[PDB]
Each structure stands twice: as C-alpha cells, then as structure tokens.
Design a protein around this ligand. Sequence first.
Ligand SMILES: [Mg+2]
Ligand SMILES: [Mg+2]
Lengths: 289, 96, 49, 83, 27, 49, 69
Amino acid sequence: TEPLLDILVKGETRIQNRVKLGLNSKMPTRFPPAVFYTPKELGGLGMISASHILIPASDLSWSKQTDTGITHFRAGMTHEDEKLIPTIFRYITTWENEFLDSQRVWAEYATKRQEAIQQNRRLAFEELEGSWDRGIPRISTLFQRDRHTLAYDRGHRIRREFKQYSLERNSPFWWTNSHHDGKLWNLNAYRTDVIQALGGIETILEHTLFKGTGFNSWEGLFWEKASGFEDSMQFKKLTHAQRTGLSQIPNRRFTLWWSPTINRANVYVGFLVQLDLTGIFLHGKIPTL
Amino acid sequence: LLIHRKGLTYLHLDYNFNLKPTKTLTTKERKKSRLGNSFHLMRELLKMMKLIVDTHVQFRLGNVDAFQLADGIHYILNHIGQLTGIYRYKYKVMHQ
Amino acid sequence: PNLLFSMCGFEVRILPRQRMEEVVSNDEGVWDLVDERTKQRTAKAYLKV
Amino acid sequence: KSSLQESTFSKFYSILSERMITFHRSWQTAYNETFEQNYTQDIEDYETDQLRILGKFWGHLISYEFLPMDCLKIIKLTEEESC
Amino acid sequence: SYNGIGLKSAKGSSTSGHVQRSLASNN
Amino acid sequence: GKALNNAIPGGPKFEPLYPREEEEDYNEFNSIDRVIFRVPIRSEYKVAF
Amino acid sequence: SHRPQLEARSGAKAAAYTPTGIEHARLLPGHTTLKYRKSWRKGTAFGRGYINDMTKSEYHQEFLHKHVR
RNA sequence: UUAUAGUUUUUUUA
RNA sequence: GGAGGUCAACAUCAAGAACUGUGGGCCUUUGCCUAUAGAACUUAUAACGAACAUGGUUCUUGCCUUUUACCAGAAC
RNA sequence: AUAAAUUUUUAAG
Ligand SMILES: [Mg+2]
Ligand SMILES: [Mg+2]
C-alpha cells in the first residue's frame, strides 16, 4: 500500500523534526542518523526507524487501473553519508509462514504427546525444544507456570477490546494476551544491526565526548540511572513551573552526550560566537547545550 | 546616539557592531532594552559594509596583496551566511 | 473474476488460479489457498491495509 | 546464508533470486554453481532445520523454470552415497 | 524524462523527490 | 514546463499551479481497453507540441 | 474586577487628540484609481422540507452519528 | 541537583 | 556660433497595433464620413532595464504550541 | 540499457 508507507515516511520525519526543534534547528548536518538510532546504551534515542526503504512510485495514472508494477523508486528518507539502516519489516516473520510453521509444529507435538503418553513418560523439553518459539500459540505457553489456573479464563479477546470503552489511555496491543498467546515476536537482532551498520561502536563514539571522559576503556561503562531519583525529589508541592523545568534535565544530559556533532563547524549557516571567557565557539545560538 | 537616547548606556557597540550588555541585566532593564527587528537588521547591514571596506583598509596599507584581496572579499560575499547573521531578522534573505 | 472482502484491517482479494490465466511468482503480499484434500495452490489471495 | 539466519523461508528471498536472474544470465550460471556448492559439498554443515528453508527455496526456482528443471539430475538417490 | 512517474513535488511529502529507474523489473 | 507540471530532465522544477488533479469521474473515454501503447509519450513531447 | 462594559469609547475622546505621524503598513497607496460604470428463501422468521432547527436536523444527526461515534 | 523553575498538556514498560 | 557637462527644470513612454494637426461633407460640441500634413522614444520568441529586488490584501498549501519571522503557487 | 536529489533560524509568552 503506497499511502501507508507514505505516512510512515512523513510521520517519522515529523518526530525527528520534533526532537530537532526541541533544541533549535532543523539542519540535517547536525543530526546524522547515528544520533537518533543508536540504542539508548550508547546514548541515543534508540527509536526504531523503518522509514527509509525505497518507495515504489510508478506513474499513478495507470496504477489507478492495471497494477502496472514497480517501475521506479522514490527515496523515502535520506542521510548525508548514507550507509543504510535495517528496517523492522525485515526482522518480522510474515503471517503465512508462521501459520504454516504452527501447523506442522503442533502436528509433531501431537505425535510426541502420543508417545510420551503411551510410554507413560514425561516430556523431554528437548523433544519440544527446537520448536520452543515456533507455532502460533507458541509452544512455550503449554509449560508456562500458571496454566491450571488460566484454564478458567475465557473470552479474553473481547474483554481486551471493550477495554476500549472502559478506560482512558491507549493500550495499543489489545489483540494479544501474552499469557494466552505466547509472545509472537522478538527483535534484539535489530539492536545489533543498527549498532554496527552505523559503522561500528568505534565510529559511533567518535561523535560523542567519550574521548573526553578519559576512559580509554569503552565497554566497561554502564552509564548510571537517574530514573530512580524520581520519587524523592518531591511528590506534590512542585508548582507547575518546577514540574516542567524539573522535567527538562534528562534532555540536557543527552544533548551534551552528543555535543561535538550537534555543535560542529561544517554547519550550513550560522553566526559564530565564542562563549564569554572560554575558548569554545558555538555556531548559532543553541540554548540547551 | 540612538541607543544612549533610549537611555541604555549599558549596551555596547564595539567597532564591528556587536551589541553586548556590559552589565548583567536587571530584568526590567531587559524589557526596556529589547531592540528592534529593524535596528538589529540594520546593525547587521552596517556590519557587512564595515567588513568589506575593512579588507580594503588592509590592502591599502599594503598588507595583503591584490590577489588575496580578490579572494578575500569573494569569501566574504559567499560566507555572509556566517560572518554576520542577518538571517535572524529578515529570514527572506536566506534566498540569497 | 475477483472476489473481495475486508476484515480486521485487511483488504483481501481472491483470485482463483483458474482465471488468472497468466501466472507468476509474487512477493510476500500473496497468501496461497491450498485445497484441503488435494494440496495445491489454487488461488492467490492478496492483501492491503 | 542470510536466508538461513531467518528462522523460516520467506517469499522475499525467492523473488530476490528470480528478479536477479531475469536481469542477466551471469547470475544464472552463478546460481547453478551455488546449487552445486550447497548440495554437494556444503549440505554436511547444515542442521535438519535449515533444510526447511532450502527445500522449498529451490522449490520456487525449479517449479517456475528459473533453475532450469533438469539441473536437478546431478542429484542422485543411492544408499551408495547420499547424505 | 519526467513521464508521469514521480510526485507533484516534495514540499509536503518529506522525501528528497529523487526518482530513479528501477533496474529490477523490465521483462 | 511549469504550467503542465512537468520537469524537463535537466529542468527547473516548479509547483503544480493547478494543484488538484484528483477530482475525476470514472469515465470511459481515455480508458485502457480502448487505447494502444505504441511509443511511450515521453514528456518532451508534451512540452514540444 | 471584571466588568462587562456597559458602554464603548466615544469617538470624541479620541477626536480631540493631536495626531501621531507614525505610518502603518496597509496604508501604502494601492488600487490608486477607481472604476466607473457605463423454495429455501422462506426459512427465516419473516413471512412477507428543511426543518429549521439543529440538533433535530437530518444532516447534523448524521454527522454526529458518524464522528463522535 | 546543578548555571534555576508558568507556562512550553505534569507524569507509563517491552 | 561650435563642442561638451556623472548639470537642472518641464513635458512624454504599454495602446483599436494603438499618435497628432489640418481642409471638406453630415448630425447636433461630442460624434460619423472624406481629404491632407507630420510623426522622436519604445515594442513580435512583444517592450522603456537582451538587467532583477521588496511590500500589502486575498485565497490554496508547507513547517506546526501561539505571534512576529516564515515554506511555494496563484490573482489583484 | 540510468543520467530525476526536499530542508537549514531569531525574538516574545
Ligand atoms: Mg505571562
Ligand atoms: Mg497569548
């Protein structure tokens, strides 16, 4: 479907646009896709960007008739240096398959159940292992803990929907009970491919200050979490100004951890000011940094 | 004269026509001291003239050479997207 | 020739492979309906969103 | 090999092969070679899963003639030598 | 040879507008 | 080039100038059953004549 | 101290004033000169203007029967 | 907790 | 009297493919018809500039917290 | 047998 991919490209561009003007600029040169796509660990937002692709464009006129087939691509998003980025839909198995795999997997378990019965034995968990995540109910469930409780749940889907009516916030995954359904996708390989495909950890850090904290050793760094401090600042008595302005810190650690890109001297346009008594030049006013 | 006639003596125009406050500003003295999209636009404008005609000022002293003159004021007219920042006030000029 | 419908979010078309009359391997937007007994692909189903 | 990272067959790699062949034949030869590689030599290194990706995966070049069919014959059925 | 493939323009659709021949599908 | 919303390949691009082309009846005149593709009609035709 | 106005400022209070001399924008001369005129089917159980108003209207009740939904 | 902090809808996981 | 002026003032420069004066006939000054004289400058891939900017209103968009400031098309 | 390429910033609340 053209327009959906179209909406992807738009929307994602619009979000990066948000983070961008979150400081002040749209300039593409400041924001190489490392910035937005490095996993949180390295200090990036880690947003999973499936925009890019290349988007079949052909000659709409007839494509209101024939399905003329792809004659051209329109570059969905861009870069400055390109590389690429792996995009999700490559890491997600399509439905047809998984229903096929499901069908067979549960056939095998039909047999192995018949044996382990007839032999009056109890399961190998190996005989089951290769199939561990295969199957649409996802065999793991059979052996999840609480089963002889959850036998007495029924009709979970509908409830998982009419929650539409019964509560305020979104719950964007209704369509599954991860208890009944197993878990229908895993990713992490994504993280790996975005990490290296950016040019490897050794380049990615060339953007940061990581040669300014004097660590010669990288991987020994866990960061640290400021998340915990959340309860003990206060609970109520912040006036609204202190709730927001006391919410603008966890940005301003990030935009420091990539400083030397965000401030950089191939900037397209800006009027240079050295800071007051320092030796640093800033290109344009960027208030946070 | 315009400035000191608004009763701001704590803004300073240096000879390149930067505007800097020399006394960290009491807030009221900021409000009375915001200046105009004009007067800022025109500050910048003068800055450009003084910049070019500077480079000449040098050359006449004999300090550069007529080739580095030509390159210089070339470089100016191209990199005014740096050397001034007039594009803050009328942004239209970001066609040029 | 076609049959249409839509369910959940999907727009499904169904072509019986009979009346396709010109056949091809297609990318993964094609489910292939398989006769219960004989086991063939007798119709391609297409999706959209 | 990426196809074998992928935990199941996917139509993707089949249409990739095909639209690569029909661009030029040097790719055609390159394939039939690789079929030699994998089947003859390199089967020994694959677990009884990945055959689930392969067997179909050549199934789709061979049904539709991109292989072409008879290049199968190089494959043999013997208790003599078959893995 | 903008033939009717492509966009009216990339102003709102956020791409770069670039459209290239598709090597894949000819036959 | 502009006013018809084309781009000569080496050409300056401009704006639709008559933006909404999307209104259309479903109308048999120019349809496919009735039209024969022999020569493509590149743009530069449309800018030439 | 919010008071509903009861009044408007007489033009006169303005009228006595001396002028300004500021020149605004929209007053720059334009349009500078005028222009003048010269079998089975039986199985199932069943044997065989403009209303001036709003929230009772036909349209509006369609609309709100769509969107607020 | 710091180089602050009224409006800039204040606050959620894979 | 001639040559010039990085001198001034005052006229004129976008239209029936287009200017003006005059003689004669008709209507009743306009206006129509006929005759006659003179027409610098600027116009046909149309124009005073084989150059190239800015502003206002009005709609359509584009960024999208709001306004200046703006994105790119049109009409006036 | 292809030569098709969007952006980019300052002030005020
Ligand atoms: Mg206020
Ligand atoms: Mg307000």
